[PDB]
Every structure is written in C-alpha cells, then in structure tokens.
C-alpha cells in the first residue's frame, strides 16, 4: 500500500508524474453530453483533464472521479499549491489519476 | 478531446461563448416544482440559467447539472472571476453548458 | 423560462416576494423525526422554513430541497446578503421556494 | 410548525435545550464499524454526539443525520457560534436533534 | 457511546492513538482503480491512509469513509490543527479510523 503519489503512480502502466508546485491557473467544467469533464491549466501552459466516466473505469472509480472534480474546484478557489499530479499519458490532455497538495 | 472551453463549445450545435471576465452579480436558486433551476447574472445585465433537468439531457448530464449549480453557488460566494460561459442559445435565458474560471 | 426570482415566483399560487437585502441572522437545522427541516431568521424577526419533504412535493423537488438547505447554511456562515426570498404564504413559517443573493 | 429550536424541542419526549452561545471546542468523527458517528465538545466540557443511524431512526432522518455531521464540521472549522442545541436526554453523550447558530 | 476519540479507539482490536497537535503537511488522493484512497502526512514524517473500501468494511462504514476523505481535504485546506488520530496499526500506512480536531 503506497505511501506517496510517486509510488502509487508507478503501480500503473501509461502513467507519469508531473511536478507543478503551483496553484491552478484556470478551472473549466462542462455538463454538455458526452463531455461531462473538468479541465485545469497551470501558468506554465500545462493542461490536464478529469476524464468523462467511461467503460475504461471500474465501478469503484465512479465516486472517486466525482471527488477529484470536487477537489480540483476547491483547490482552484482556495489557490492551493498543487505539488504533483499522477496522470495517464495515453490521453490528451493527460488524464488525472491522483493529486498531491503540499506547500 | 478538447483542451479548453472554446474548443469544447464548438463541438455542439446552437452554442456560443460569452466572455465575462467578471464575478457573478447575483445567484438565484429555486426548488419550486418544474422550476428546479439556477439563474445567474452579471453586472453587464447578462442573465444565464442552468436548465431544469429534462428529456433533453442524457443520464450522464444529470450528475453534471447538479455539479454546475454547486459550482455557480460557490463561485458566487467567493467572488471568483468567471472567464467564459459556453451556452446554448436556443433557450432563454441562454442555458449553461460549460464554465471556465480564471484570474 | 424565468429571467429572475420575481417572474419565477409569479408562476405559482400562494406565493410572495420578501425583499430582505440582508444577511441571515440565525440558522436552525433539525434531524428530529417529522421535523427534518431548516428555519432561518433575519434581524427584524422574519422567519422562514425549508419544509419537511412531503406528498406536496414532486420527485424532482427532493434534490432541490436538499440543495436549498445547503445554500442557506453556507449563505449564513459566509454572511452573504440575501436579496429576495420567494415563499409560500400558506404555511407558517412561510416556506422557501426560491432565493436570490446579490450585493 | 415550529418557529424556533426551543418550540421544536418541546414537541419531543426526552429532550432538552442546552444554551451554549459559543463555538465548538473539539470536533471528532469516526468511520469505525458501528461507531460511524461525530462527537463535539464545548469549552465548558459539555459533550454531544450525532448518533450512529439505527432502528430508532425513520427513513426521513437518514439524510438529516448526514447533514448534521456536515454542519457540525463546517461550524467547527469556521468557529461559528452555536446558540442552542436540542438534544435527546436518554443517551450519553446527549444526542443532537437540532442546532441553532446565531451571532 | 464513547465521549472521546481515545475511548472510541480502545473499543477496537489493533488500534492506537497518534497525538499530532499539528496541521496536515500534505494531502494526496487517487481515483486510480483499486487505489481509490487518500494519504496524509505531517511535518514529523508520519504518514496515514484512508483505506480503499473493501470486504473488511461493513456497509455502514462506506458513507463514513467518503466523509473522512471530505474532512481530511478541508482540514488540509483550512490548515486545521489535528489533535489525535485513531488508526488501525495492522496496515501500512496506518489506516485512519477516527480523527479529533481541537485548536
């Protein structure tokens, strides 16, 4: 059972860590059909998505996808520094699997 | 697989982008029957709705409609700048499909 | 499709607008059986309730009732100014149908 | 239909009102099995619980129990003053039925 | 019922109290399949998890697990002082059973 985001990220294929150490620059969310997703950017130009729930996700990820969008919204609004994102790099924008926040 | 609200908005019929770059001026919410909806305005006089869930919405949009009203409420209370709205222009008030928040 | 709370309120019988332009003075919440409700007051004494869900409510109102109590609690804690309430005046306390926040 | 927490409390057997007019001193919450509950204390030592959902509860109370634990947490974190609690007397700690918050 | 986290903790096998009296240093959460979990750390090096929901959990614990991750995120973002954690010490990182917050 992993002790940090880097070790967690390494348990999966097609992932990587992006280190941001910065607040979120913009937060976007959509209710449009088949694009029920969130998109965040950072001032360095990096863009990430929380994917639309799909057949790629198992049932236990459903609640966590919803939570992640909650987390990104409040992080954005509080200007919380994002340390790292673990992302799947076989999607464009890279798809968020995990987030760490630290000052 | 869009990277921003403008490219997302462009995937749908009967939509357009409004650029606000302003905080929400007023936030209204109703629990009355058949009008379970939210309405927001900006100081420029613009009015937008989150529509009552209906037959025009597929299942996956229902959860995202609830999220959007949560987003608008907290955006309003924190005086967060709304960058852009993607809206359907075949409804009055124009109906929100997506929001971006920046600055 | 309503442009504002006054127009929305006018679509229903037994309603009226109260214009408060003030923050909520007190917030009360109960989980007692058959009294699962919220009550708010303003400094002048005017009292309003979010009614216990009952057979007068259609299914779509259930989520909106829960949303309204969430809204009143955060409005209270943030000292947000309530502009207007649309209420049913065939109940005591008058029962909230919609709320507008501005200023 | 009660105007305030004192009148609501008086509708029930084994209840009493505690007048605190003070912020929550401590907030405790548990996910351990059969102890899925919250406990709060005030600086005077008075201690209160939100009971684990049980056969004493009716269905309409389930969502309100969850809401009450939400309210207690955010009240604690914002240092909001608690005016009164209506509690059941026949449990230790006394079990919260209702809360009022006021300036 | 228990009046405090220490008494609550002692009701269970394989638990202990950690006394932190410090804000959370880092907050991590994951939506990756089979690792839908949260991890927190403190400046003293201590690391804790909210376990992925599984067969060891009774159904009533499920909502409480989701609540705990909510609480840890907001505690982190508000820099709220964590007093104590009750944990299962038969897991690595130690698994959170309960939390107490006090200033």
Closest approach of chain D CAs to the CA of C9, in angstroms?
23
Q: How many CB atoms lie within 10 A of CB A29?
A: 24
Q: How far is CA A72 from CA A40, A50, A98, in A?
A: 8, 9, 11
Give the whole-angstrom CA distance, residue A83 versus residue E16: 30
Give the whole-angstrom CA distance, residue C36 versus residue C74: 18
- Going by C-beta distance under 8 Å and a sequence separation of 6 or more, which residues neighbour residue B72? B24, B27, B38, B40, B50, B96, B99
Contact D69, D38 (CB under 8 A): yes
**Is C100–B27 a contact, with Cβ atoms under 8 angstroms apart?**
yes
Give the whole-angstrom CA distance, residue D87 versus residue D67: 16
How many Cα atoms are found within 13 Å in the side-chain-facing hemisphere of E65? 22
Residue of A nearest to B64 (CA): A31
Interface test with C, best of D66, D71, D86, D97 (most C CBs within 10 A): D71
How many separate domains does chain C show? Answer: 1
Helices marked H in chain E — which ranges? 5-10, 59-78
Q: Of C36, C51, C34, which Cα lies nearest the Cα of C92?
A: C51
For chain E, the helix, strand and coil percentages under 3-state DSSP, each to the nearest 5: 25, 40, 35
Give the whole-angstrom CA distance, residue B50 versus residue B65: 7
Q: The domain spanning residue C18 has which CATH number?
A: 2.40.50.110
| B93 has a chain C CB within 8 A of its CB | yes
Closest approach of chain A CAs to the CA of B26, in angstroms?
18
Q: How many CB atoms lie within 10 A of CB E45?
A: 7
Q: How many CB atoms lie within 10 A of CB D27?
A: 24
Residues in chain D: 103
Show contacts of A75-79: CB within 8 Å, 24+ apart: A75/A23, A75/A24, A75/A99, A75/A101, A75/E77, A76/A23, A76/A24, A76/A26, A76/A27, A76/A40, A76/B101, A77/A27, A77/B74, A77/B75, A77/B78, A77/B80, A78/E77, A79/A23, A79/A24
Determination approach:
X-ray
- What's this structure's resolution in Å? 1.6
Give the whole-angstrom CA distance, residue A76 versus residue A74: 5
Q: Cα-flanking dihedrals φ and ψ of residue C102, to 5°?
A: -160, 145
**Is A31–B5 a contact, with Cβ atoms under 8 angstroms apart?**
no
State chain B's maximal CA–CA distance in angstroms. Answer: 37
Rg (CA), chain C: 13
Contact D57, D66 (CB under 8 A): no
Query: Quick check: do B and A touch, 3+ CB pairs under 8 A?
Result: yes
Write the burial class of residue D68 (CB in 10 Å: 0-12 exposed, 13-18 middle, 19+ buried): buried
Q: Which residues in chain C have Cβ-Cβ distances shorter than 8 Å to B92?
A: 1, 3
**Is B101–A26 a contact, with Cβ atoms under 8 angstroms apart?**
yes
**Is D75–C77 a contact, with Cβ atoms under 8 angstroms apart?**
yes
Give the whole-angstrom CA distance, residue B26 versus residue B23: 9
**Is B28–C63 a contact, with Cβ atoms under 8 angstroms apart?**
no
Residues 4-63, chain B, touching C (beta carbon < 8 A)? 25-37, 39, 41, 47, 49, 51-53
Q: Of B5, B43, B4, which Cα lies nearest the Cα of B26?
A: B43
Q: Cα-flanking dihedrals φ and ψ of residue E26, to 5°?
A: -150, 150
Give the whole-angstrom CA distance, residue C33 versus residue D57: 7
Residue B47, domain extent: 1-103
State chain D's maximal CA–CA distance in angstroms. Answer: 37
Write the burial class of residue A13 (CB in 10 Å: 0-12 exposed, 13-18 middle, 19+ buried): exposed
């Amino acid at each position: 059972t992993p002790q940090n985001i880097t070790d967690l990220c390494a348990e999966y294929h097609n992932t990587q860590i992006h280190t941001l150490n910065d607040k979120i620059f913009s937060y976007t969310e959509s209710l449009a059909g088949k694009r029920e997703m969130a998109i965040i950017t950072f001032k360095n130009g990096a863009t990430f998505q929380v994917e639309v729930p799909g057949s790629q996700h198992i049932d236990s990820q459903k609640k966590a996808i919803e939570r992640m969008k909650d987390t990104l919204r409040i992080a954005y609004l509080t200007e919380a520094k994002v340390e790292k994102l673990c992302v799947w790099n076989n999607k464009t924008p890279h798809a968020i699997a995990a987030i760490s926040m630290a000052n």
